[PDB]
Amino acid sequence: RYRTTFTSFQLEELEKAFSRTHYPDVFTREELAMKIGLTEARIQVWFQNRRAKWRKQE
DNA sequence: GGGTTTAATTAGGG
DNA sequence: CCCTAATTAAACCC
């Protein structure tokens, strides 16, 4: 099973995107993908896990 | 190595 | 496709 090891860069940008919105549109997601060198799919997945984590800390 | 985090997958909702 | 909760398993880090 391949697992992505995100760089600190990818991670800080994912988090900055998340403060902006928990549910980014397609365009936001594809723009971020071009920026940080991840697929939209992996961003979507990161966002799924980020939202469940965020949810649990309430 | 093992406990914690967390990327990825599964099985469920419309 | 838009998601979820729960699970699985790999990476991080002491």
Curated annotation (Swiss-Prot):
DNA-binding annotation, residue ranges on this chain: 1-58
Q: Tell me where on the tree of life, at the top rank, the source sits.
A: Eukaryota
Q: What happens when the gene is disrupted?
A: Flies display a reduction in size of the arista and scutellum, a reduction or complete absence of the tarsal claws, irregularities of the sternopleural bristles and of the wing vein, and a bending of the wing blade.
Q: In which tissues is it expressed?
A: Expressed during embryonic development, in distinct epidermal patterns in head, thorax and abdomen and in an endodermal pattern in the anterior intestinal tract.
Report the locations given in the UniProt record. Nucleus
Family, per entry: Belongs to the paired homeobox family.
Role: Involved in the morphogenesis of proximal and distal pattern elements in a subset of appendages. Also has a role in early imaginal disk development.
Supply the name of the protein.
Homeobox protein aristaless
Q: What is the lineage of its organism?
A: Eukaryota, Metazoa, Ecdysozoa, Arthropoda, Hexapoda
Shown residues in whole-protein numbering? 87 to 144 of 408
